[PDB]
């Protein structure tokens, strides 16, 4: 009890998350498939704001136009019945065997064209359902061997695909934006644009860079041992955090997709502190898998746990930042000096400033403790409710 | 014998590499310090093209102007005696205790100003010695705890420092360029700009982005489990491979700095294949540590091994690419199709192309094997000399 | 050409390896299922010595006695037709949803009993087919959360299961032995007995420890960042290398199961050097997955590559050890002294030996270089055929 | 405030922890050396129970007998002044250059003998100071290359060294026991006995195995991506947890030695839950490094944080286990069934039990959810104080 989510909290879930049947590389499904209608209803009951989908989550692959219409009709009626939104959608360019060597960067040109047409079709549908963000996860773009993919060529093809997608949404007058979801590996041995940084750098070479941002996932950066709050900070600094995927992950191993808050709890705390202090206004989207040990009821407890954990961490981070003792510790550690310009007086003033070099007392500066440990223990006490 | 390096091969070494005394976090030095003069002479004898330096490698910290002049004079005479060049230099912003919380992103503003003045001083010296590249390795820019560094503020300070450095070299009319050397961690718990991608993305927000590239290191990207040849390919694609650091590393652990070729041998092969096929013309710089088990003679055998291993891999990669059977396998795997534009016919033609979607035979495409394993075994046979 | 395997080389393959249809967590199958008969025939044609199986690879789960008999009959006729052997078999205690919380350590007692009965049934079949080793891979024994499994209780249950299995084979007079296959994670978040060491230690608490050894897999120890040749050496030292699984893996990430020789090539070289120099006489078993990009022909090229790579590395390691220059380098590095007893003169002689402490010249010893780098470059030259 | 440690809590610290001057591989010291006397006094003031030492922490290397006596005399007076104990001691076989290739497993035989004599000398001193445990950390036992160390030979030498040490303490009638501290890597590329499992397995081949246990360190098992509470559980199961090193670590990277509670907070919670529920009665020893950003006051805040975090986690784990709602959830997840014997009725009864196989309803069992997520969210709510 307490920490009750409401749609105002902007919590969203992929249809593929609570709908995961439990198939893993070594195991058959442990749960029956879910009707997306029932997922929308169960999530709304938990306080979710909305759901997201792959084209093939909502409309089974190979569906006829008649079936397509009826699937969308039922989905639309579930959103109307609940008030749930659809802020984001994405294309499945990874499940069908045809994408075994990739979608946009498949060596076979005809597969690349098919991947683009499959995406364009779903962009139209996502706009009709109100999505503001279209996510691209190039899970099959990569290689297990060095000769199989010329990466420069593949980046050329990747740029062509995203440029074409940008040309398309511009030509329809759509307001939707694109977000690249990086992942370093799995299912490919190495995946192109493996981290937030690589995706941010890639975007700066696109024809219309303002149309594209990142959709970073907690577990994906942690799969490379990276600091996810640091990556988010650089995404925010670049103005490119269009969307975020929240979940949990225990270090460098297979993609776990634990519920948010599990995995690296302290990193979750610093992430929530950053998102709230930066004023991130996008969806708080959970891309997690209820473990296959769970039954139907365990699925919903897992989804509820994601939201609850976000709300607990939100309260603790806010109490941390509002605490006068923390505010004094932050001054003691010179976080206020970190926010001041190094040299607003300009280069020439810096060059003539004898206190910056010729008369800098390097030993007195070096002897100044940063007091980071007392600050960090204050953060821990706040996280744990032990103040 | 065979595989004999010559200065034409552009092999360079940091003074700090063969000069490493063997101090590690758990151990005292195992070798005496080297005079940079003797290192220049011993490396030239091995076939090196040149050496690189930290300011504090060449001139001991705190040196007087008179001592500074004599240190440079002796170094200059060693280069003249040997023909060795100095293509690159860098600032030590990590050893002195004053940098314990960083150089350019230290929370203390006066340390940030000192770090800039220390760098500017060394840029002048590096230009005098002929360096074309100035490397920045922010090894102390980062944190061990989440409250200690606001990363957005720190990126603001990092951008200010690099912009100021760019303003300086512009104001002197220097031709030297900057290269960011990323590293994900160590000595800080997490280091800012942790990978090639993060550095590439950062550079695109600098005031004069054309002045800045990356100096990626084999072991640093492998410390995050990333594919180093992939990262190099994205750097080349962006036109930003200004410099490279070659060494070896066994996966995700402390920074090993093994001689090049040790560590991930196959990744070294694919790296050399990429550098040569892309026509990389910069220095082949080794940033390695002769293990502290080695004596003075073991240092030079280790340095010789770096160059020899590059030359062996260069021969094998070239034989791989020139092999008609490999060239046929590459066509079989459709690497030629990967290099063709996905949709040179334009968006509207793609949208009307029924063979791209409505009449695409997705099952026939999916059943087409990529033949990647036969290609990879050809690469292995070439690497091993087992054709 | 060259490096042609023959059954004398003892190369074996799981039915599940070349038979893998390509289903991964993000993808549908890319190849049709194989009849085990055709796999036996295709592998024999490649020079394999034999095949191994899970109960459910050879007899589909839930088969009737009549179907069971006919499946075995056809399999037996394929072995007779080819000369192939079945040196090892194992139980599938991981695919069926009933094992979602484990087999022998499932929290539900009735599942643990079922797992034992399922294994006992297959031990009888494996003995009939001539298997000398029965492998246990507890892929589902573990947890994603800390409260879900009391590990001490689970080790009690694991010991009970293995003791019962040992009591069973003793009671039938079977000569078959058990081998634990460790894996640190995946499909569980953490797996019990995660490494060779943990399995070796566990075995020493079993009732009849001599009946049990390890079946270490290259990729599984590398998934924990461990040195696989080191782990094999400790298994050999303990006398417990009953079986081995050969494949490739690129560091710490999901279980890749690349063909042997791919992944960490140098670790493969040192492994083959150790297995041959120790005189390992068991099967050279490949537990690999032909990547799902491959078609049927790519499967067999991948299997052929496993064997070829073993044979190349075998030749190079042997040339390394037989080289008089290497033999001299090994003396220079004091590998001969490593093999001599530290104190065959006994404790009291060591205590009175003033040359061991009071008069030990610690600086002269410390100044002695180990010459490890020249030795390692000799190993690299031999591996690469660059002598 | 609250969570105040007392010596009854058995909190101990190495002299090398709070005494760490801040030298890392890239940096000079940031703090002056501490007199062990002042460390004993400052730790006692914080509520510590005792301190531990390397021979060379307490007596500078190469000290004369007169200096040795005076160093011990002053240390003894600090313990008498404070009431602090010395429960454990260890030998520095890693700092001096003579150990660059190892101590007990150095290739040079004379170094191995010296290492044994250096240890034996310190065992006498540790017994005089009251130590119950003597720790061996073979940080230099290992290799950076495959030819440099024959691991079977090295394990022979390691067994000889530990057997000799066991013969020595037996011959003096000492009650002290040995504890192996595993570490997977750093400072060597790979370290022998890399994990708790490998050390446990090694001990079972020693002549007097009952004399030897493990001293596992949180960060060392996490450096291999392993679950530390799982490793502790297997150590407890084997009856070998003689000592423990508590600290924090962020995943797979260099050895961080963060204060306990930092790093993987949830793993710390499950560790404390296990230690308390198993009734571990040994020292709660912190092997951590106050980050080199800290001054003298930051050192003591860091040490205080270790103890405080243990006490908070102890309270929360106890509240978790005592909660009737948690106790009901544990029954719902069948943790009570995990603790029951699988087959106390014996093998033959299991073989005839048709409910264990022929009539086992495998689908009804598989459909039973484990309810692990609701249990884990209860654990999270308890950890966070959000019940
Ligand atoms: O395409 C978007 C989604 O695709 C798959 O579900 C991936 O597992 C997930 O990481 C991503 O958010
Ligand atoms: O500053 C440049 C150099 O600094 C240090 O030597 C780092 O260890 C190295 O990675 C880098 O190349
Ligand atoms: O049960 C034995 C086998 O089971 C599965 O195939 C595992 O993937 C493999 O690692 C193991 O060898
Ligand atoms: O020798 C025992 C101690 O040695 C060193 O201090 C190691 O860093 C530490 O892990 C260990 O506890
Ligand atoms: Mg995602
Ligand atoms: Mg470098
Ligand atoms: Mg296996
Ligand atoms: Mg320790
Ligand atoms: Mn994921
Ligand atoms: Mn490095
Ligand atoms: Mn595997
Ligand atoms: Mn440590």
């Amino acid at each position: 009890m307490n920490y009750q989510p409401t749609p105002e909290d902007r919590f969203t879930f992929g249809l593929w998350t609570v709908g995961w049947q439990g198939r893993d590389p070594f195991g058959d499904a442990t749960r029956r498939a879910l009707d997306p209608v029932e997922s929308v209803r169960r999530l709304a009951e938990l306080g979710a704001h909305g759901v997201t989908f792959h084209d093939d989550d909502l409309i089974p692959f190979g569906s006829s136009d008649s079936e397509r219409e009826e699937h969308v009709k039922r989905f639309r009626q579930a959103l109307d019945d609940t008030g749930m939104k659809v802020p984001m959608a994405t294309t499945n360019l990874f499940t069908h065997p045809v994408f075994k060597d990739g979608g946009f960067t498949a060596n076979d040109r005809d597969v690349r064209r098919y991947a683009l047409r499959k995406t364009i079709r779903n962009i139209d549908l996502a706009v009709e359902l109100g999505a503001e963000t279209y996510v691209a996860w190039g899970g099959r773009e990569g290689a297990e061997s060095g000769g199989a993919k010329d990466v420069r060529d593949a980046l050329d093809r990747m740029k062509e695909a995203f440029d074409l997608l940008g040309e398309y949404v511009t030509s329809q007058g759509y307001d939707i934006r694109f977000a690249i979801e990086p992942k370093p590996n799995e299912p490919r041995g190495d995946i192109l644009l493996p981290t937030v940084g690589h995706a941010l750098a890639f975007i700066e070479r696109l024809e219309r860079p303002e149309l594209y941002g990142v959709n970073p996932e907690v577990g994906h950066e942690q799969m490379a041992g990276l600091n996810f709050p640091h990556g988010i900070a650089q995404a925010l600094w670049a103005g490119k955090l269009f969307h975020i995927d929240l979940n949990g992950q225990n270090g460098i191993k297979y993609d776990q997709d634990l519920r948010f808050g599990a995995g690296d709890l302290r990193a979750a705390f610093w992430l929530v502190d950053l998102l709230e202090s930066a004023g991130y206004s996008g969806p708080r989207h959970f891309d997690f898998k209820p473990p296959r040990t769970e039954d139907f009821d365990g699925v919903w407890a897992s989804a509820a746990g994601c939201m609850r954990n976000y709300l607990i961490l939100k309260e603790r981070a806010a109490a941390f930042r509002a605490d006068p003792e923390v505010q004094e510790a932050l001054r003691a550690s010179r976080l206020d000096e970190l926010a001041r310009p190094t040299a607003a007086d300009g280069l020439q003033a810096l060059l003539d400033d004898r206190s910056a070099f010729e008369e800098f007392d390097v030993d007195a500066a070096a002897a100044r403790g940063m007091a980071f440990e007392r600050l960090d223990q204050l953060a821990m006490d706040h996280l744990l409710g032990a103040r």
Side-chain angles (χ1 to χ4, degrees), chain A residues 102-381:
Chain A
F104 298 158
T105 74
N107 285 2
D108 290 302
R109 172 170 181 277
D110 57 345
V111 170
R112 301 196 294 273
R113 290 170 71 87
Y114 173 71
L116 278 164
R117 292 286 309 277
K118 191 176 194 274
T119 294
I120 285 152
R121 194 176 184 212
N122 199 53
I123 290 167
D124 292 338
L125 173 55
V127 170
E128 297 166 306
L129 291 164
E132 267 136 46
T133 301
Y134 201 87
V135 162
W137 174 60
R140 297 284 177 203
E141 323 307 325
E144 293 68 63
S145 53
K149 195 70 50 171
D150 182 284
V151 171
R152 288 183 291 168
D153 289 329
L155 290 167
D156 287 341
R157 304 290 80 75
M158 189 86 87
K159 164 176 164 61
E160 286 169 352
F162 279 104
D163 280 343
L164 279 157
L165 294 178
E167 185 188 353
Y168 180 74
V169 301
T170 300
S171 83
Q172 304 301 110
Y174 294 158
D175 304 316
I176 194 157
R177 295 183 308 175
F178 296 101
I180 302 330
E181 178 169 346
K183 193 188 185 181
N185 66 70
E186 187 189 53
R188 309 306 310 265
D190 295 293
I191 294 170
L192 302 198
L193 314 185
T195 77
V196 166
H198 295 80
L200 289 173
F202 170 74
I203 280 159
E204 291 301 323
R205 296 281 180 278
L206 295 182
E207 200 189 283
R208 312 166 199 70
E210 68 280 358
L211 256 74
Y212 310 86
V214 289
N215 180 45
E217 178 177 309
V218 171
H220 291 179
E221 308 299 297
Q222 292 176 356
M223 273 175 93
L226 298 180
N227 181 306
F228 187 70
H230 284 196
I232 293 314
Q234 186 168 347
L236 288 162
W237 186 73
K240 299 289 194 186
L241 191 68
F242 289 4
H243 204 265
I244 195 162
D245 276 15
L246 305 169
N247 61 10
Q249 169 79 17
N250 287 296
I252 311 192
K253 49 174 83 171
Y254 70 103
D255 190 26
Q256 293 196 285
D257 288 345
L258 303 184
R259 75 184 192 291
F260 177 68
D264 193 335
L265 179 50
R266 282 250 277 168
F269 168 86
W270 291 116
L271 172 67
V272 172
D273 170 72
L274 175 59
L275 291 178
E276 298 296 322
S277 91
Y280 169 67
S281 61
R284 272 76 174 163
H285 179 249
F286 298 106
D287 185 4
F288 82 116
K289 267 89 164 64
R292 73 195 278 282
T293 60
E294 300 309 287
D295 62 22
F296 177 86
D297 293 333
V299 164
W300 309 117
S302 206
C306 287
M307 279 173 315
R308 181 180 178 83
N309 285 332
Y310 190 102
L311 290 179
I312 297 163
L313 298 176
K314 180 191 214 232
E315 166 193 80
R316 305 303 167 79
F320 172 76
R321 294 287 175 185
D323 188 343
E325 192 171 341
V326 166
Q327 286 168 6
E328 165 208 325
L330 289 165
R331 289 189 299 270
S333 296
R334 277 91 79 203
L335 277 301
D336 58 318
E337 285 198 36
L338 180 61
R340 320 214 268 263
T342 294
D345 50 345
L347 171 63
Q348 188 61 66
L350 174 62
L351 290 174
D352 300 326
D353 184 1
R354 292 185 62 84
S355 81
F357 191 70
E358 286 94 350
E359 306 159 34
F360 184 54
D361 192 346
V362 86
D363 287 347
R368 221 177 297 141
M370 307 303 311
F372 288 154
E373 285 295 276
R374 167 162 159 62
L375 177 59
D376 193 52
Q377 195 52 50
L378 288 172
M380 173 94 48
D381 288 344

